[PDB]
């Protein structure tokens, strides 16, 4: 089988997009920003 899971204790918030983790939800959210494709130009021009 596999071996590991040594040292219990993992941040409560974890990014389920790339594989990042943070202690303060705040930070995590600020990160996702990049995951939500942050582009200047939108579907329309105005
Ligand atoms: Zn991420």
UniProtKB/Swiss-Prot annotation:
Signal peptide extent: none
Similarity comment text for this entry:
Belongs to the krueppel C2H2-type zinc-finger protein family.
Functional summary from the UniProt entry:
Involved in histone 3'-end pre-mRNA processing by associating with U7 snRNP and interacting with SLBP/pre-mRNA complex. Increases histone 3'-end pre-mRNA processing but has no effect on U7 snRNP levels, when overexpressed. Required for cell cycle progression from G1 to S phases.
Q: Where in the cell is it found?
A: Nucleus
Official protein name in the record: Zinc finger protein 473
Provenance organism: Homo sapiens (Human)
- C2H2-type zinc finger positions in the chain? 13-35
**Superkingdom of the source species:** Eukaryota
